Amino acid sequence: MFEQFESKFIDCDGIRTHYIEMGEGDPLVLVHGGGAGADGRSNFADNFPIFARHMRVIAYDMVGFGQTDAPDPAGFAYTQAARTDHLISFIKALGLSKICLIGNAMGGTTACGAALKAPELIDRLVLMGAAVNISPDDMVANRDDLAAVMSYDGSEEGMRKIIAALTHSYQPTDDIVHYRHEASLRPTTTAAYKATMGWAKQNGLYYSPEQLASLTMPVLVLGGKNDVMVPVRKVIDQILAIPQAIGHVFPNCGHWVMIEYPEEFCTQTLHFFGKL
Amino acid sequence: MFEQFESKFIDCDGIRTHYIEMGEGDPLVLVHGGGAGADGRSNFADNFPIFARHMRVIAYDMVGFGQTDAPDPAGFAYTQAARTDHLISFIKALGLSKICLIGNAMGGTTACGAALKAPELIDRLVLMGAAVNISPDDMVANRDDLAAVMSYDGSEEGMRKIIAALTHSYQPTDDIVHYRHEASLRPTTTAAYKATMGWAKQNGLYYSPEQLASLTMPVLVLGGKNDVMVPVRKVIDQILAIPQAIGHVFPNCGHWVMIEYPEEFCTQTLHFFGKL
Ligand SMILES: O=C(O)C(=O)/C=C/[C@@H](F)C(=O)c1ccccc1F
Ligand SMILES: O=C(O)C(=O)/C=C/[C@@H](F)C(=O)c1ccccc1F
Ligand code: NA
Numbered sequence A, B: 001m002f003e004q005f006e007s008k009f010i011d012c013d014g015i016r017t018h019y020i021e022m023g024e025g026d027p028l029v030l031v032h033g034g035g036a037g038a039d040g041r042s043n044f045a046d047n048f049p050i051f052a053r054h055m056r057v058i059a060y061d062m063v064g065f066g067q068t069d070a071p072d073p074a075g076f077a078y079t080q081a082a083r084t085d086h087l088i089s090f091i092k093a094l095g096l097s098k099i100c101l102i103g104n105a106m107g108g109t110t111a112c113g114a115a116l117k118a119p120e121l122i123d124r125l126v127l128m129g130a131a132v133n134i135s136p137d138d139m140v141a142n143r144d145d146l147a148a149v150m151s152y153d154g155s156e157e158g159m160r161k162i163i164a165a166l167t168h169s170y171q172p173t174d175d176i177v178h179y180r181h182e183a184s185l186r187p188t189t190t191a192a193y194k195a196t197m198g199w200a201k202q203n204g205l206y207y208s209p210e211q212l213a214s215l216t217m218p219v220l221v222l223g224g225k226n227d228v229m230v231p232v233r234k235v236i237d238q239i240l241a242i243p244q245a246i247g248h249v250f251p252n253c254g255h256w257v258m259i260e261y262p263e264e265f266c267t268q269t270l271h272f273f274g275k276l
């Protein structure tokens, strides 16, 4: 699946990193979520052609996901810092500067991490249902709704349950479910995933109010009102914690704004990027 | 001032009502705020030409304001119900149906009132810094920041203070200040204004969470993050209280989104109206 895009690979400080790209013009990097079996292609396949009409759009796979290396967790710590450094390494490896950057959930954590740590690489930032203020205590309190993703049972029904959790009223195709299930079944990513999620569960996915206020570039914060992974009040706290942030909230919409309301997602981000 | 627009007048159940209009196509009615000297022309003069390119745009003056009748408060109660009924009467008098409707502050109260009471007239509703959940207690607690408007001293500096309160970083022209000061000085509107504001102060500008959830048509809720009259957390409560509502929050922006970020205000509303 997704063979309409040419898989490319590049070395990021020894992590061999998969990505796709389309279009031309200024760079836009998209960072996928951390649910089981997720990657750039599957997260952003519908948005890619819209974005490609205006920008050079790039989706990569995070360390531990997709077709990027998933180093053995016997010797590799799957921490948020590892993701953030991977993203930074990716951006430099492609020779990119002043990028537009969108991150979904754990991808939002990672996009926000890079914006904080390597601001000189990023002109504009979009956080979409970004896990940037989910503390360990929040992981405990929201445990029931987070279970589908964070303690994924490895099965096919489990993958349908993940997708029904991430969305308000979306029926995925049998093909998307199969694609993600198959991806999730591979031993190396099953292992990297348990490490990723075990860390997240005890350290949360979190920056402090002061860190969030320290962002130096324009920010757009997006959220589905019905999101159960990063609830709307957490997205609202992000809008208020980041002084320069624009906030947009989508009704009748779960975590996956970009799949549930693809056209609306691209219009708002493209508008914010100065392209419409 | 504002003579680029032809003043028109129409009778609304015995209240002679001033309005302007421009463009053609589907109707869009704009409802101004309730600050001293405000009216349709002065509130929406910059937005009018943008909107006119796509719709038939109409701004009227609320009972007690502008060049609409300001019936003697010895015999007229300046209640929110009176405003809401005036708006409904206006919409029917022009022979309009399925309108788009935008209300600012007390105009938001009035737009929301009409949407609740005469939903069959209104297809889409925009609340911009709308006073739709400001209780009497809220009037007391936010009294210091509300003083410029609600206990306006009648002077010219007072009018500059009103405008500096409504905005984050806006210098109005001497002409706009003069226009509003002059308007505010007339005895009949000075009197209607004190009645309007005295009522508001003790009854608030308020619908209940259940009333807000009862809206039957699409809603877009807008707010400036720095608004001091209807603070952003009150606008956020509106987004959450109204299930179908889209929320948009503007950074570096006071109460007057439509004057501070005119192009951005029209793009978001026009997009929501299905015109872009
Ligand atoms: O799997 C996806 O495509 C996706 O976007 C899921 C997001 C998500 F579940 C993830 O990033 C996450 C992990 C732990 C806690 C909260 C999350 F929101
Ligand atoms: O005067 C204006 O142009 C305007 O938009 C002001 C809004 C406003 F002050 C008003 O509607 C109001 C009255 C009482 C309490 C809060 C308000 F927000
Ligand atoms: Na669901």
Ligand code: NA
Residues within 6 Å of the ligand: B164, B165, B166, B167, B168, B169, B254
């Ligand atoms: Na100000």
